[PDB]
Amino acid sequence: KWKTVSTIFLVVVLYLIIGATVFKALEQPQEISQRTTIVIQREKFLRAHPCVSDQELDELIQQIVAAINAGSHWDLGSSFFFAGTVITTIGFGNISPRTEGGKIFCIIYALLGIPLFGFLLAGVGDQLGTIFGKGIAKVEDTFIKWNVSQTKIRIISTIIFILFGCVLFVALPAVIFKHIEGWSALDAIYFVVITLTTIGFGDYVAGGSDIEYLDFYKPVVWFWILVGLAYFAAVLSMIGDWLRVIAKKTKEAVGEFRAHAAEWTANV
Template identity: 70%
Template structure:
């Protein structure tokens, strides 16, 4: 069995600020630099800005034509409606549309008889909304409309978000311990097969990510596809947007007023969000630590190359000087011998 060096202790995955996710990737005597240099911050800022600009250009190219077509379609439908219903004025139509938009923004569907639709503020829905507040997802499909509701939401978020942060860190630590032990078992199996430590670390990490994706992404996406009637792409889109706390609100589990959900459905969805957020936080933290480790190792390798180059240059210079000294001595001796012979 190959001996493992001190650079690869057992992995520890965590979202806690007091421990890095991939501390195993470095030697214990070499801790991660906790404070970035300004040059590094500026470089990362430039990369993020370029990334944002590129993303904006791509989104505009993909979405703006569709938006323009929708605008033209709405304008034509309004014109056709006014032409076919001459008793309705344009002002009356615009007022009706405005009321419908306001109702939709308030979470009330203007389609059909709204009194028959399920409430957005029953116990399960209210519990789910409270969960989106403290997790900072904020889908936006439902929001407080009353003054009291808005004031309470502010206070609830101020105290609830830090509380949820502590819970998330604790669950992340437990998940990190579980997955860390699993990865250690995988590494133990591969060590018996004489696989290099670097390959073992890559394979075990990939297995960790794949297992998490199956548990927290693939299986929930299949369930949402079946219950919500979404496509596979829409289900995966909702899962990723939710667990990364983006929360656009265009797709929300339990948000279809035409579907009668079980009372436990939304609380169960929130529990999935809780555990899934801890997993995604661990993965994102691990990626961030990888980048820091890679950056540091690259600097160390460059430093080693410079040191070798300097050493090689010093050796060549010393050898050159020694050769020149020997040649000078030999030439001097030959000249002296020639002078003696004469």
């Protein structure tokens, strides 16, 4: 009958405000640092090359920033990657359609492929879940006849799910990404989380740089994208369940606190 939606809306607004403050705190300093150390560069390149005017260099900069949309972008490999970024809704954006017909086809392609890929991803997740059900069935039998509790064997099994999944789907792909892309470890894990959450900023792409790949590589990361999107769907849903549980525990904690203030003053 009632909402409950208003309080979670307010919680989301609060979460966004806290996040915005923290992000500003962590990111504005390096931004102003790079801004002043590039206004150093604009006039240290110009005085080191007197033949460039102060206004012809700006013609150069204007056309280079005009080249923001191009720099092939559209070999069958890169367009296959793009189609993947569309139907997965990752949408890195490093590749994007510029002609109107490309955008119209992109609209149709998204509206049809997102549900179809949803079916594929659901099936992949179900098959992984049954494989993992048998896998937990055996270690839930070795460790099961010792008196250990039953409603905590499930939390030990979630511990094992999280750990094994994050080593197979986050850890070793991250180390491979660092050894192949040249990314840092933190940058690799960042890429993993941002792509498998379907956020997909595009500041890092697993086949973007020119660095020449082993050709065994893009298909394997395709497979990793498929299986990791499923794993991360599971992880995000279980975090949601964590949230609803802690939500009711906090609801009862506020109930208890106000109930201990209630008749604590009836103590007259």
